[PDB]
Design a protein around this ligand. Structure first.
Ligand SMILES: [O-][n+]1cc(-c2c(-n3cnnn3)ccc(Cl)c2F)ccc1[C@@H](CC1CC1)n1cc(-c2c(F)cncc2Cl)cn1
Length: 236
């Protein structure tokens, strides 16, 4: 996260850190708890992941340094990538992780709601991006989960900033015209979380952008409301 600040324990309890263990253990992507056995993340995360065997899902983590050899994690039973996914910039950047067992929800590990049926024309004005990613283009993965408030951009404006890409209704963009706050390397797969009527909704999945927090180059997120039917089909 560029231009963000440290979170405190329990502040984003749907946020998980997805680790790979091949050839060594490290943070790979963010993700969001959406059900007791379900994580929503980005399809692009699994480029070069040979199978679910090497994945570990950690919940309730504030600092990456908390994770040691006896820290409990969830195994991944299945990776479900959208059938039309080809590359992040061309959309369909969405994946479900089915966990091997059910998360018991606690103060540190909680689900986030999907965008609600009948909220298609809500204007979300309280949106946040969170993650352990770089604070700038050439940086490092952060120990403490970071947060930043970022405004949504219309798809019309976003397309004008990305005339070499097809910005579709299945994407949502977010960023300041002057730049300075954005996701960056290591944040992808995590949530764009928006609060409406004091309930948090998983509005976006951190996906791609040109650079990090550059002027007039918003971050691009998978528009989760356009995939609710797909999510419900796979999770039922
Ligand atoms: O995370 N992430 C974020 C953006 C992004 C950008 N960026 C544009 N240029 N950089 N970021 C801008 C806006 C938005 Cl919304 C974005 F989602 C683009 C790509 C990525 C991911 C893909 C990769 C998982 C498949 N990634 C993670 C690392 C990485 C690393 F480098 C060092 N150690 C550990 C890690 Cl996991 C590198 N890439």
């Amino acid at each position: 996260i560029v231009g963000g600040t440290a979170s405190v324990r329990g502040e984003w309890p749907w946020q998980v850190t997805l680790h790979t263990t091949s050839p060594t253990q490290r943070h790979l992507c963010g993700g969001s708890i959406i059900g007791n056995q379900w994580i929503l993340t980005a399809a692009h995360c699994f480029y070069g992941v040979e199978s679910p065997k090497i994945l570990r899902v950690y919940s309730g983590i504030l600092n990456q340094s908390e994770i040691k050899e006896d820290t409990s994690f969830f195994g991944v039973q299945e990776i479900i990538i959208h059938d039309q996914y080809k590359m992040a910039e061309s959309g369909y950047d969405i994946a479900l992780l089915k966990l091997e067992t059910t998360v018991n929800y606690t103060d540190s590990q909680r689900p986030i709601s999907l965008p609600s049926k009948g909220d298609r024309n809500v204007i979300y004005t309280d949106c946040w991006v969170t993650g352990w990613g770089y604070r700038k283009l050439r940086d490092k993965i952060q120990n403490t989960l970071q947060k930043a408030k970022i405004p949504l951009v219309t798809n019309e404006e976003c397309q004008k900033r990305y005339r070499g890409h097809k910005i579709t209704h299945k994407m949502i963009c977010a960023g300041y015209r002057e730049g300075g706050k954005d996701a960056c390397k290591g944040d992808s797969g995590g949530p764009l979380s928006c609060k409406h009527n004091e309930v948090w909704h998983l509005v976006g999945i951190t996906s791609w952008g040109e650079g990090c927090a550059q002027r007039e180059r918003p971050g691009v997120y998978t528009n989760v409301v356009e995939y609710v039917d797909w999510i419900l089909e796979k999770t039922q």
